Amino acid sequence: IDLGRVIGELIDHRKLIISITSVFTLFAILYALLATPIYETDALIQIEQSAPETALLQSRMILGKTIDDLNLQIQIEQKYFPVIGRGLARLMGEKPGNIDITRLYLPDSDDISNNTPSIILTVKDKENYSINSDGIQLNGVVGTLLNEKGISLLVNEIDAKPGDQFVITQLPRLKAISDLLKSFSVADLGKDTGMLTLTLTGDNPKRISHILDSISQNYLAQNIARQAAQDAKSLEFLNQQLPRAVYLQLLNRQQELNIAKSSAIGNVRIIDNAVTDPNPVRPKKTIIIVIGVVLGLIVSVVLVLFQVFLRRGIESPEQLEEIGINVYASIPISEWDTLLAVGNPADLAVEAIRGLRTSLHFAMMEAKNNVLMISGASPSAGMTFISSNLAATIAITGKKVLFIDADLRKGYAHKMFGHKNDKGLSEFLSGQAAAEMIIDKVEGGGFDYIGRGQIPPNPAELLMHPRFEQLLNWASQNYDLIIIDTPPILAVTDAAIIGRYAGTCLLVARFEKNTVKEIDVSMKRFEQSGVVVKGCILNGVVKKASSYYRYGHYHYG
């Protein structure tokens, strides 16, 4: 392989490449713009060790105390029906609502799976609201507490617009502790310093700072209680041991234990109370977009390379000429039930066909007669197109041309010429017609034709009748050229029967559909039946940047 080929392949598949990469980048944009932002707050603690303090900070006792203090077991979620409603609502700048709830008790269904009772509260105004558990609709009002049907509830300070809905869950205490723990991190950053960095991430920029402050306060107030206690145990013992110099000695010791109890400041000190970084730490938009674009490019390039290594069709006449097959022409796609050589006589395809005509005028000398047979390997390769247009172009030069549609199975030439469908080729071959009622005139052409006629049940066996050769011998004395259109050779054997009487035979190979293998097989199958194929005609060519085989398929005039 070389660089020019791969550059050409990318240029040719640019449409697919752009489409795939743009779709991937669009999904990356959507995700990076709709994912819920995550803020992070931190605090700094000084230790007057530091290995067990990490484990004590993340203990269930301290976190549980924080949860009990701040009621983290009442979970409130603004309701958006889709997995994108929250993100879009944020994008339009809509302010999310919040509700203060200070007392909650659900009936605690507690089935096998759903251990977490929940309700839905719809806000109706600044004061009242509707509550539904499983369709049980109730009305409540801010202020007054509610106890109905085994639900106790107290709501304060609704801050939202009417019509909003909120999911309210009363999750178990241990679940709340686990949720708090998974978002809470502690590090040492010095491996010897009394420095601990506490970090907490969450979706609410203020709630996380409040939670981290509460955690720090609980830990600190717990720590000093430890030091105060052992002094307090000593102070209690001395007081219990009180029964005069020793009497004064214990009193002075008691005061020293009293002052040591009150001077609490000890091993733990709060350097920095928690604050929240206003820039969310997730999602990291730029890296998301870069990964999206790179992924799009990689998958597109792999897909293109895949398609290149699985492509097998013919691409240039050089492929056919390596095997030893003469390519007499290359016809491009005509982007333009009428003969092309009549509707648009200046088309590029008709120019290529004129080139083919001049090639034939030299190839068909020293042919045993003036009969030309066009065939092909696979159906819808262009045999009828080529044959009909070639007949038209040869006819406009003042030579008498006869076009025979010997495709007794799917021939539609009569439709494309304007027809009297009676008395086709079938009726002549079967013996129920003469040679004169079958020949018809093309209107916009200038040549005669013979249509197939009625589809017979035994096409291949009809073509073996000697009346066919009689017809060819008779017509070869009244016309300058006879063109015969035939079915494919890989499908049926009609072409190989007809080719016995044809002076010249050509194959039509469709540009990207057929492969070299079919063409070689077709040539060999024609040879085995005693038919010598002059050469091939490549049809349906389009411009490929990767080709480096380059035609005269451009307008000149």
Ligand X SMILES: Nc1ncnc2c1ncn2[C@@H]1O[C@H](COP(=O)(O)OP(=O)(O)O)[C@@H](O)[C@H]1O
With CB cut-offs between 5 and 8 Å by kind, which of ligand X, a second copy, Mg ion, none does residue 379 bind?
A: ligand X
3-state helix, strand, coil in the chain (%, to 5): 40, 25, 35
The reply to whether 384 sits in an annotated binding site is yes
332 annotated ligand binder: yes
Task: Report which of 403, 398, 399 is spatially closest to residue 386, judged by C-alpha positions.
Answer: 403
Least distance from C-beta 347 to Mg ion, angstroms?
20
Instruction: Identify which range of 41-49, 317-325, 378-386, 515-523 contacts Mg ion by CB under 5 A.
Output: 378-386
Q: Which of the choices ligand X, a second copy, Mg ion, none does residue 393 contact, using the CB cut-off of 5 to 8 A by kind? A: none
Maximum distance among all Cα pairs of the chain, rounded to whole angstroms: 158
412 annotated as a binding-site residue = yes
The binding track of 325-354 with respect to ligand X, each residue x by CB under 6 A or -, is: ------x-xx--------------x-----
**Least distance in Å: CB of 404 to ligand X?**
14
Q: Which helix (H) or strand (E) holds 293?
A: helix 285-309
Q: Is 403 in the site for ligand X (CB under 6 A)?
A: no
Is 380 near ligand X (CB under 6 A)?
yes
* Cβ distance to ligand X smaller for residue 216 or 384: 384
Residue type, 292: G
Binding-site string for a second copy from residue 31 to residue 50, where x marks contact by CB under 8 A and - marks none: -------------x-x----
510 annotated ligand-binding residue: yes
Told to check if 389 binds Mg ion by CB under 5 A, we report: no
What whole-number distance in Å separates Cα of residue 81 and Cα of residue 97?
16
Q: Which is nearer to a second copy, 148 or 272 (CB)?
A: 272
Tell me the closest approach of the beta carbon of residue 459 to Mg ion, in angstroms.
13
Among the candidate windows 129-137, 211-219, 381-389, 548-556, which touches ligand X by CB under 6 A?
381-389
* Interacting residue with a second copy among 1, 3, 51, 365 (CB under 8 A): 51
| Cα–Cα nearest to 173, from 112, 119, 222, 108 | 108
At 416, phi and psi to the nearest 5? -80, -15
Please give the structure tokens belonging to residue 409: 């199975």
> Of 296, 382, 446, 535, which one interacts with ligand X (CB under 6 A)?
382
- When CB distances are held under 5 to 8 angstroms depending on the partner's kind, the choice from ligand X, Mg ion, a second copy, none that residue 195 binds is a second copy
Q: Which of 350, 409, 351 is nearest to 379 (CA)?
A: 409
Q: Which residues precede a break in the chain, with C-to-N distance above 2.5 Å?
A: 48, 243, 336
Q: Strand 137-141's sheet: what is its strand order?
A: 74-78, 165-170, 118-123, 128-132, 137-141
With CA atoms as reference, report the closest residue to 426 among 453, 392, 397: 453
Q: Which of 389, 431, 427, 386 is nearest to 408 (CA)?
A: 427
Binding-site size, ligand X (CB under 6 A): 14
CB atoms within 10 A of CB 543: 12
Residue 56 interaction partner, one of Mg ion, ligand X, a second copy, none, beta carbon < 5-8 Å per kind: a second copy
CA atoms of 152 and 170, how far apart (whole Å): 12
Beta-carbon count within 10 A of 353 CB = 22
Q: Which helix (H) or strand (E) holds 449?
A: strand 448-450
Residue 485 annotated as binding site: yes
Closest separation between CB of residue 355 and ligand X, Å? 14
Alpha carbons 370 and 387: distance in angstroms, whole number: 15
**Alpha-carbon span 544 to 342, nearest angstrom:** 29
Q: What angle do CA 286, 288, 293 make, to 5 degrees?
A: 95
Between the two ends of the chain, the Cα-to-Cα distance in Å is: 38
Contacts to a second copy from residues 157-196, by CB under 8 A: 189-190, 192-195
When binding is defined by CB under 5 A, the residue of 223, 384, 426, 514 that contacts Mg ion is 384
User: CA 164 → CA 98, 124, 155, 438, distances in Å?
Assistant: 10, 8, 15, 83
Query: Least distance in Å: CB of 544 to Mg ion?
Result: 26
50 or 78: whose CB is closer to a second copy? Answer: 50
CA distance 265 to 307: 74
Asked if residue 379 binds ligand X (CB under 6 A), the reply is yes
Instruction: Give which of 175, 264, 270 is closest to 215, Cα–Cα.
Output: 270
Q: Which is nearer to ligand X, 97 or 379 (CB)?
A: 379
Does 56 bind a second copy (CB under 8 A)? Our answer is yes
Q: Is 383 in the site for ligand X (CB under 6 A)?
A: yes
Binding of ligand X by 296 (CB under 6 A): no
d(CA 347, CA 343): 9
Site pattern 274..313 for a second copy (x: CB under 8 A): -x--------------------------------------
Residue ranges that bind a second copy, judged by CB under 8 A? 44, 46, 51-52, 55-56, 59-61, 189-190, 192-195, 271-272, 275
Binding site for Mg ion (CB under 5 A): 383-384, 407
**Which residue ranges are tagged as binding site?**
332, 334, 380-382, 384-385, 407, 412, 485, 510, 539
Instruction: By CB under 6 A, name the binding residues for ligand X.
Output: 331, 333-334, 349, 376, 379-385, 539-540
Output the known binding site for Mg(2+).
Answer: 384, 407, 485
User: Which residue numbers belong to the known binding site for ADP?
Assistant: 332, 334, 380-382, 384-385, 412, 510, 539
